[PDB]
Structures are given as structure tokens and as C-alpha cells.
Subunit: 513 residues, 2 copies
């Protein structure tokens, strides 16, 4: 029936082969999983080198032969399209989940039961997460400082964790407005090597990496009135083609003086507004700079269009098209506009804004690489503070959730009884991989840590436990402000289970040669 | 350095390959392990068929290619030479033990620790077995009947388990003499299809499958005096070559009458002893049968030399070489010697012996195959009764030992602490394979049974639990007389651990191509 050369596996042979292939891949990528996960270096037959942690990338680049291994590759791609993250997690968890599930099959527990038990326990797991979650004041000063400081600790920047935690909480709180949605676009990160980390600071305003275009401009302006124009301050010309037809010598002068008046009127109007700072999107003719300078007006030219819009938002200036439309109500306020040297380079500071909706955090450090990591550290601190502001729920980490779930699910298992309890029992036992690889990747005794932690948790409670990989001992997770959003864990479970259910649904595998 | 063609694996690659090969073999044979283990049919390239359960045989016959698989074959052979049994057990247990041990290696627990923890827990396991063992009266009538009856139940012969349990306990108790060593050689098993199992019985004597050689012999003898001779009752001749040299006609008669007297004197002497039964090892001339018959003496000829010795032991007759040495003190006693037809065939019954040291259990049944299985059933009942008579210790089965050990070892683990506790913890977790495969091979829910049993055991106690595969529910193991010798379990652990220690000691594998 089939072309000679085609190969086929069926029943328990199809199952054995498929599972085994998937498992081996899982063992290959699992070494990247987690905060303490490491990376791989893949050098193709051409010499190109890729160093990554991404499961898809590793699997996409490698050259697989086995059909069963090629079919699993599709799983990794669908995981990326659907959810984005959890590629490595889903493969590793899916493998163990399938392995433990097959142990039930060998016991003669119908796969419809195993899959149902997992579904049921998985849905109940989300409820338990919502139940054990510790509710907090979204804008609580003290707890916020713990989130911030907890992130900063264990990094080069820890030397000034107190000041940094302060500025970070304040920056988010300012731009968030209501309680709350945050747009991290209103918090700029400028990093310039020089000084130390102690010099880092928050600026309730903006730090632009530009200079005052002309030398003759004032070096200091107080109570500045900033103007934001996007139209070029040049001699406008009609869209329709035009040309002057001179017929008398009197006109040679007539037109020259006409263009001079137009140019002077332009500049004169800007001054008439009371503006002492002007940001133009297009060009500024040299002569215009000269008059601007003589009027003690500070000007900037050739500003990016996207920057013109960021400048409007930050400074609170209204972009006007026609000068005719400009009014005092369109002017923005800055408490201070000053030229400062930072690591020698000249930069402009717009600081002491009344109630800025965009702030900048100028980072200092003894090295480029240092300020880069400090920037990453803050990107996270803003992130986690944002998570708590939108979802006033927090939860202990160090695999505390999975332990709570394992306990309660075991009791629930007993309530249900029958074969279905075995399926719910296996789900609870499967959850232990998290604790297992947390301490394994950390280089802690996985067996001993789990025994000590679980015991300590059962005694001291929920907010007096977890694993502290840094000190290698139980602690107070709450006191140490070591918390993550519930959404992290909830979404992880959801996407993870939906992938496992797809695999569990397959009862027939037909792979061509 | 090495000849091109040679292949080498080292470090974690040598370890991965070796473990994996061993594991796959273990999965192949594990389906035979246990009371509910099944058999395999192996048909070589020649057509020969072997159906066995033996691990060595299966592995010896199969044609392996992989060097690592060939090296494991040596394990199976050494297991046979050293201990005999536990070939399949040792391979299967050794595989899982190695797998669980490698999980510790990945956690960075020095293999010297893992091996030590197993050794320590294994030695402690033997102590715990001696501690939990329930001591009983070696010759307790009632408990003995439970051992007997428990064996018989669930077999074709169960219809008469009460009578059979009675005869079996009595047979062993009689031949054991002191308390106690038993020689199963004193309990003969004769099986002849015909009648039913209800007709089975014990005979305090012997049942020989022979006939009375001559028709004219008495058909019934009371208070019989049995003689056991090994010398032939013929005309003796000198070792040195001799010949009669007749020189007178008077001698032709002289010698004839001389040989007649010698022959008559022989026979006359036997009668003179008061013997009415005679067992001769060699031949009996027809004329001798005639006189023996006329004297109402029963005789048997051409008896096996080994049978002559069994006849001496059983009947309590003393084998004499020269008739001159025979005396009344050499005579044996039998309460009855009678010819009976059993399934038509004629057999001799030596029954109603005073205090027989050898008994026979005549088995009846509607089929040959039935009486054969009944014989096996008794061979076991005698065995287990023998185990209890020599070691007045018994213990609950159904994996009760391993559960007790798992509990106590876990506490001991906590006492020791450190990494060593993880090794002792893994040993305790490894013990669960027994419960796992007991219910798996039985077709019971392995997970659910274990949960129910352990809980029930923790509540009802030690003698109110175990698994009862027959009813598929907890029971009272003691009330049901479902016990095994401690020696079974103790030796199993000892031999098993010594094989595992050999594997654990290997840190270098060098296999040629």
C-alpha cells in the first residue's frame, strides 16, 4: 500500500518514540530554565555564532533529522505565536507531565481521566493562587521601597539602594496619575559613564543630549517661557509656482525690504509672546539665530518629529502650526533650563517642572557596562512596581505557591477519590519540578532545601519562608520584599496546561520517512 | 594511540550510555518479576523455542551486540553463581537504584555519600525486619493450619483445604522429630489421577508402586514381620575359580542333594526368624518364590539399591548382608501390608506403622494436571511450615515491611541530617517499587491501593492490613494466615544491595568496539 522506503510506528511504539524524542530535547533546553539558567553557544557549519537562551532559536537553528523531533519543533513555534514566553518552560514541563502521565497509562488509567484530572487541578490551582495572594495598598510608600530595594540588592548599584529605591517609586507614582495604569514611556533612562553610582539621581523634568546652537545665546534663563513650534521660520512660498516680475528700479529695494519685514515680524512675534526658549522642528537660518541670540532667546534646530511630540508632552508646550494661532495658553513651563557638562559632553537640563508627567533618571557609574546594568535594574523595578499598582496582589516566591497547591490538591484528591484522585495527585507531584530546578540551578541541595523549607513554611507560615538563594537559607520573604505578581504565575500555568492538553489529546502518530 | 575502529566513551557519556542500556534490559525482564509475573517465548534463528521466566536464560539466549549490554550480562551470571535467585530482582532494583542515585549526582552529592547512605539504610533495614517480625510457637497447631490452608486456598484443591491442611501439618510434625530441622525427603508425594480431590489423604507409612511377584502368595497378612535383605538368595560361589571333580556315580546325587539343602536352609532360616514379608535387592529364583508362597511369605524382587535404603528408613528394618547375622532385633514393623487397586493399577500399602519417620500423601483428582498442581501446592505448604519451624518468626506481606522501613528510615534521615539524609531518603523511596509492581502485576490501581493500604495500616496496625490481591482490598493478614519467612526478605535485601554496591563503585567504563 505504502511506497517502499516509508517507515511507520503505531500504538505503544509510536508513543514510546515520540515521548522519548521530546524528553531528550527537554533535557537539552532545561539547563536554561529559570533565573539561574545558563546559555548555549551554537556554531553552524558556516562559522556564524549564536549565543541565546531562547528555546525556539536553539531548535530553529539546529539541524534535526528525526521526523518525531521535527514534529515537536512545531510546538515551540506555536508557543511563541500564541503566548511569547514559556517556550522552554512548556517543553520541559510538558515532557515530565507526559512521562508521569504514561506511568498512569501503564497502571491502566484511561488517558481521558489523566487529562481531566490535570485540567481540574490546573483550574483549581488558579483559584488557590487568588486565595493565597496577599493584598496590599497599591500606592503604599513603605512596601514600594521594599520592591525597589529588593531588586537593587545583589547588584553593583546596591551601594545606593536606599536613594535609588526612593527615586524609582517616585518616578512611577508621578507619571501613573490615577490608581492606576502606568506608561513606562514617561520615564526616560539616560546613562553616561563617569562619577560613581552614588551620583545617580532623579530629575523631575527631562535631560536632552543637545547643545544651545549659538554661542551668543544667554547661558542662564530664569522663569523661562518655552515655545514649541513645528513650522519652519523661513520665508514661506506659495504652493502654486510664482515669480516676481520687476519693471522698475524702485522694486529692487521694495522686495528686499518686504522680505526683511516678514522675517523681522516673525521673530518679533515670538518675542512678543514672552518666550525665551524655542524648539523648532526644521532649520533655523543663521540670521534668525543672531536675532534670537540678541533677544536672549534660546533656540534649538533640526529637532526630530518624534522628539517634538515628546517635548510637547514633557514640557507641556502646545505645538502650533501657524504663528498667527500661537497664544500664551500654548506656552509651557520649566523651572530651569541650563547647560551642564556631564563626562565633559554638553547636555541640556529641563528641571524643576511644576508637576511633570515625564521624568528622567540620570545614571552615573565608573563604567559604561555598569550604568547599563543599573538601567536594566531600574527597568525591572519600574516593572514590578507597575504590576503591583495595577494588581494590588502580591505572593511569596521560592516555590511557595506550588507547595500550597500540592498540599490542598492532595486533600481535594482524597475528597474525589476513585482513579481521578491519582490524576490530581500526579499534578500535585508534578508541581515540585519548580522547587527542584530552583535549587538545582542555584547549586543548593534540592532534596534537603525542599524538606527544610516546607517544614519551616508549615510552622512559621506563608510570609515567613521561601528559599533565599542568596543566603542559602529560609528567610522572611515579606520582610525582604521578595515578591512577584500573581499574573506571572497564573499565565504561566494557563499557557502551560493548554499545550500539555494538546499533547495528551494525541492518540495516533503517523510520521513519514 | 588506539587502533582506528576502536570506540570510546568517557565521563558523563560513559555513565549515560551504561545506565540507559541497563535500564532498557530491566524494563524487558521486570514483566516477569513477582508472583503475578508473566513469561516470555523466545524463538531462535533455528526454530528452537524456549519459554522461561529466568533472567539469565533470556539474556544468555538472546544475541546482544552493544558492548555495554554485553557487560551487564556478566552481572546476571555472577548473581546466579553467588546467590541463585534474585537475578531479575537484582537487575530491576539495581537499575532504578542507579537511576535515583544519578538524580543525586546531578544535585552534586558525592557518589561516596549515596553509596554509604544505601549501605547504612540497608543494614538498618535488616534490624527493623528482625524487630517487626512477629514471634510464634514453632509447633502451634492453630497457626500451622492457617499456613497450610492459606496456601491451598485459591487453587483447585481448595474444596478440601481443611482436611489437606491437617494432613500436611501432621506429616511435617511427625518427620521433624525435634524443634527443629525438617528433611522433606521423609515426605513422599504419590499422585494418581482418579477419584476427586476430596479422596486425597495422608498415610502414616509408605505407598509403593509395585506388585506381589507371585500369585500364590497370601493376599492379607496381619502383624507382619518384614525382612530387608540385600544379598541375593542364590547359591553362593567362591571368588576363586572352582569346579567339582566327580569320580564316582554316588557323587552325581551327593552334590544335587547338597545344593538342595543349601537352598532349603536359606529359605528355612528366613521363616525361622518369623518374617512374613521379604524385600530382596537382587533376583529371586522361581523355585524360591514357590517356597516363599507356600510359607505364606510375601516377597519382592529386583528392588532398587536406593529403594532398599529408603525401605530401611521407612519400615525400620535393618539391612543385613549375611543371613548368619540376621536377628529379631533387625526386623521392622508395619501395622498393615496390603495390595490395593488405585485407578485400576496394583500398588502395595505399608500403613499403620507405629511411629513412622517417613510418610506418604496419596493424592487423588479428576485429572493428571490437577494432582500435579496439588503436589506443587503441598510442596509449598511443607516448605513454609518448615521455614516457621526453624525460624519461629513470621511477618506481614503485601509490602508491609518496605512501608515500615520507609517510615522509620525517613525519621532516621532527619536525625542524621546533612547530605547523607538525602541518600537514606532515596533508599526509603526506592523501597516503594515492591508495592508498585505488586499491584501493577495484579492489575490493581498502584497509586490508590498504596494510599489506602498505608493509611489503613497506620490506623488498624501491623497485623490488620497488607494487600489482598485476591479480594482487591485490605484485610487481616494474620487472620488470613498470609505470611512469609523473614529469611526471604532479609536475603533478598542482602544479595540485592551487594550487587548495587558493585555498580555504584564503578567510576570508569572502557568498552572496546
Amino acid at each position: 500500500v505504502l511506497p517502499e522506503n516509508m517507515k511507520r510506528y503505531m500504538g505503544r511504539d509510536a508513543q514510546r518514540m515520540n515521548i522519548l524524542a521530546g524528553r531528550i530535547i527537554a533535557e537539552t533546553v532545561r539547563s536554561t530554565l529559570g533565573p539561574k539558567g545558563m546559555d548555549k553557544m551554537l556554531v553552524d557549519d558556516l562559522g556564524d555564532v549564536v549565543v541565546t537562551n531562547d528555546g525556539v532559536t536553539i531548535l530553529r537553528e539546529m539541524s534535526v533529522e528525526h521526523p518525531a523531533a521535527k514534529m515537536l519543533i512545531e510546538v515551540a513555534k506555536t508557543q511563541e505565536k500564541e503566548v511569547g514566553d514559556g517556550t522552554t518552560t512548556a517543553v520541559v514541563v510538558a515532557g515530565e507531565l507526559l512521562r508521569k502521565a504514561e506511568e498512569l497509562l501503564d497502571q491502566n488509567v484511561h488517558p481521558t481521566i489523566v487529562v481531566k484530572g490535570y485540567q481540574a487541578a490546573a483550574q483549581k490551582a488558579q483559584e488557590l493562587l487568588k486565595t493565597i495572594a496577599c493584598e496590599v495598598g497599591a500606592q503604599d510608600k513603605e512596601i514600594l521601597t521594599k520592591i525597589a530595594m529588593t531588586s537593587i540588592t545583589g547588584k553593583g548599584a546596591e551601594k545606593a539602594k536606599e536613594k535609588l529605591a526612593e527615586i524609582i517609586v517616585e518616578a512611577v507614582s508621578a507619571v501613573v496619575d490615577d490608581e492606576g495604569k502606568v506608561d513606562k514611556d514617561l520615564i526616560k533612562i539616560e546613562k553616561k559613564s563617569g562619577a560613581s553610582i552614588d551620583d545617580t539621581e532623579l530629575i523631575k523634568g527631562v535631560l536632552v543630549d543637545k547643545e544651545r546652537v549659538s554661542a551668543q545665546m544667554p547661558k542662564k534663563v530664569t522663569d523661562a517661557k518655552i515655545a514649541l513650534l513645528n513650522c519652519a521660520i523661513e520665508i514661506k512660498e506659495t504652493e502654486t509656482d510664482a515669480e516676481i516680475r520687476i519693471t522698475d528700479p524702485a522694486k529692487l529695494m521694495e522686495f528686499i525690504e518686504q522680505e526683511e519685514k516678514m522675517l523681522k515680524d516673525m521673530v518679533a512675534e515670538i518675542k512678543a509672546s514672552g518666550a525665551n526658549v524655542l524648539f523648532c522642528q526644521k532649520g533655523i537660518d543663521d540670521l534668525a539665530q543672531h536675532y534670537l541670540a540678541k533677544e536672549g532667546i534660546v533656540a534649538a534646530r533640526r529637532v526630530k518629529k518624534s522628539d517634538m511630540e515628546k517635548l510637547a508632552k514633557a514640557t507641556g508646550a502646545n505645538v502650533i502650526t501657524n504663528i498667527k494661532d500661537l497664544s500664551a495658553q500654548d506656552l509651557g513651563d520649566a523651572g530651569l533650563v541650563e547647560e551642564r557638562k556631564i563626562s565633559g559632553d554638553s547636555m541640556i537640563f529641563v528641571e524643576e517642572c511644576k508637576h511633570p508627567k515625564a521624568v528622567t533618571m540620570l545614571i552615573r557609574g565608573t563604567t559604561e557596562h555598569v550604568i547599563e546594568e543599573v538601567a536594566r535594574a531600574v527597568d525591572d523595578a519600574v516593572g514590578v512596581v507597575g504590576c503591583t499598582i495595577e494588581d494590588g496582589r502580591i505572593v511569596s516566591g521560592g516555590g511557595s505557591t506550588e507547595v500550597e497547591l500540592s498540599m490542598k490538591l492532595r486533600e481535594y484528591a482524597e475528597g474525589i477519590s476513585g482513579r481521578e484522585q491519582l490524576a490530581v495527585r500526579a499534578f500535585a507531584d508534578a508541581l515540585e519540578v519548580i522547587p527542584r530546578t530552583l535549587a538545582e540551578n542555584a547549586g543548593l541541595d534540592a532534596i534537603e532545601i525542599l524538606v527544610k523549607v516546607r517544614a519551616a513554611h508549615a510552622s512559621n507560615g506563608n510570609k515567613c519562608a521561601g528559599l533565599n538563594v542568596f543566603t542559602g537559607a529560609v528567610e522572611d520573604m515579606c520582610e525582604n520584599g521578595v515578591v512577584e505578581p500573581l499574573r506571572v504565575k497564573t499565565q504561566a500555568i494557563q499557557s502551560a496546561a493548554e499545550s500539555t492538553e494538546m499533547l495528551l489529546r494525541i492518540d495516533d502518530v503517523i510520521a513519514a520517512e
